Amino acid sequence: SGFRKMAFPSGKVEGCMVQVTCGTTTLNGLWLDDVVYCPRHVICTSEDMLNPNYEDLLIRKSNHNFLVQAGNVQLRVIGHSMQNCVLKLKVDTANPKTPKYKFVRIQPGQTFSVLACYNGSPSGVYQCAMRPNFTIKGSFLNGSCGSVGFNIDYDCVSFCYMHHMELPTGVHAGTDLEGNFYGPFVDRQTAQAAGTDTTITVNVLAWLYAAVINGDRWFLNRFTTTLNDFNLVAMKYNYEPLTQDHVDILGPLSAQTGIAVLDMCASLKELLQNGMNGRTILGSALLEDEFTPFDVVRQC
Amino acid sequence: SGFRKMAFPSGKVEGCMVQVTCGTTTLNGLWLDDVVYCPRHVINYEDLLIRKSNHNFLVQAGNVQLRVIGHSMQNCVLKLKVDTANPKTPKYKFVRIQPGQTFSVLACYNGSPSGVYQCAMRPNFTIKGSFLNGSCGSVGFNIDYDCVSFCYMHHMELPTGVHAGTDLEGNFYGPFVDRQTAQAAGTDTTITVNVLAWLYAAVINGDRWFLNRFTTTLNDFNLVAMKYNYEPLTQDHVDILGPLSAQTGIAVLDMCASLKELLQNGMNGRTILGSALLEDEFTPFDVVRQCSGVTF
Ligand SMILES: CO[C@@]1(C(=O)Nc2cncc3ccccc23)CCOc2cc(F)c(Cl)cc21
CA nearest A39: which of A180, A144, A163? Predict the structure, then answer.
């Protein structure tokens, strides 16, 4: 019993964290096999941040300009290339701590663990989700660039995020490990704003199922709803539309608890209307949306 | 920016997790140097232990079986002497924590780490953890520089869904025993110093709506705290909150008048750091560590 926001054990990722210095900029890199991945803005100066031409800046660099530090050991850069917004520094040593890994691009609503690092040193691990507006609500200070998001499944680390930037609202923007940004963001200091955020409806429903599995039933009701009527209501509370895919994904939780998805949808509709009335669900006075249906089954 | 419930990186502890099987019971063990620590309920514990031989304990470190060459009991923890010292043994200490202190838990099943979360030792000595069958022996820890301080080992789940365990010397936290009998957690209280630290973290993150022009005496605050099932705030707590008070310009007793208003009036539809409740599982040190980026 019990329901906690749980991150994956960070050990397999800690052995990959390195410090990457280029000129005055120092950030984090991900050392997998003989390649160090990091945000390409590590080659940026003050005059080259509003409108940087990364191809032009990278061509002027040599391997000895990049200082890579793995613990108290300096790695030798023997090559460099750019793939979208990620810089790939070829090194002369393969990381012996390289775990089994994959690069995966995730969709909004997906969760992952973040290993927050400063100067190639891991300082904390937390869990978060890709928001529907493609930002992440992380905990990041200056120097955290290059910190990665990941999931672990059957000894394999799936790298899904690399931190690049903080937007004016305190939220964070980054890329997958192939350097493709999540969202309409660019790695320029030009005016950029996150779109209005919405609640991850399928995740709130999964958490309501987790609450039922843990014995919390006060919010349940005798009502069901059509998927269209639920979507008309939920959209008014800035909740993401619930698709037939989400309804199908919630199937196992619906079977385990005996509460049909559209019946759980009617309990959610009612919670949005009444609020909690001094009550909590799984120790929370707010509806929690950073647990996917897969996380709920995993934890319960 | 941002404030998250953040655990210590679990890598140094992952290299210590092993599976301990004795009879039909399989749980987790902590392999440090040539000793495997685990809950003694894996086996009148003196009478039961004397009947067990070293070959009855099957210890598995990854896909490698360790051979038990001795066994002893220290309070509610079993210590299995093994022939091999763990090459991944980090610099470590066994520390007993106080209620209100926080630590990271590496939840394991069959000697395999599955998740890491951060939590506080409640004033009633339980932890509001997340554990399933097979999680016994999972450990709680803090990391100070390069040193792992082991402070907790999981033993059981109470009927209310909360968890009970021991320090690494086998001394239970709270009035709990490792036996199937009627046991209930006492009424819980809110960790006052931690709520104040979390209000300072909110101010550091730009959330100021709850601040007011008022201050209070420590005694008047404690009278209000007693009424709302909040732990008493001592002069030690006030002193510990000093650096956060200096950084934000809000005296500890000034933040207490804010907490007092929040307790008597509520949030009024507003949130603090994305929460509609006052969060009490961040210590003053956790707040400083996160809002300054200390690495391990
Ligand atoms: C060089 O990194 C920047 C940044 O956002 N860094 C940060 C990332 N995380 C947390 C942060 C907390 C506070 C301060 C900065 C943070 C600084 C601002 O300008 C820019 C502009 C950019 F186009 C890019 Cl891709 C990065 C950056």
Answer: A163
Same domain, A121 and A182: yes
Q: Within this chain, do residues A2 and A139 fall inside the same structural domain, yes or no?
A: yes
Terminus-to-terminus CA distance in chain B, angstroms?
20
Quick one: DSSP state of residue A106?
A: P
Fill in the amino acid letter for A201. T
Give the structural domain span for A92. Answer: 15-99
- What SS3 class is residue A231? helix
One-letter amino acid identity for B45?
Answer: Y
From chain B residues 24-83, the ones with a CB under 8 A of any chain A CB are none
Question: From the alpha carbon of A141, which atom of ligand 1 is closest?
Answer: 12
Q: Can A164 be counted among the known catalytic residues?
A: no
User: B158 vs A58, A282, B127, B161, B184, CA distance in Å?
Assistant: 59, 16, 10, 6, 6
Residue A134 and residue A73: Cα distance in Å, rounded?
36
Query: What CATH number has the domain bearing residue B158?
Result: 2.40.10.10
- Find all residues with CB under 8 Å of B51, minimum gap 6, and list them: none
Q: Among A169, A197, A225, which residue terminates a domain?
A: A197
Sequence-distant (≥ 6) Cβ neighbours of residue A295 within 8 angstroms: A111, A206
Distance, CA of A60 to CA of A205 (rounded, Å): 52
Q: How far apart are CA A185 and CA A85, in angstroms?
A: 11
Tell me which residues have their CB closer than 6 angstroms to ligand 1.
A 41, 49, 140-142, 144-145, 164-166, 172, 187-189; B 1
Residues B76 and B209 in one domain: no
The last residue of a domain, from among A175, A197, A219: A197
Residues A75 and A25 in one domain: yes
Q: Are B279 and B219 in contact (CB under 8 A)?
A: no
Per the structure, the count of domains in chain A is 3
CB pairs under 8 A between A and B: 132
Cβ-nearest to A3 among B1, B113, B130:
B130
Q: Is B41 a catalytic residue?
A: yes
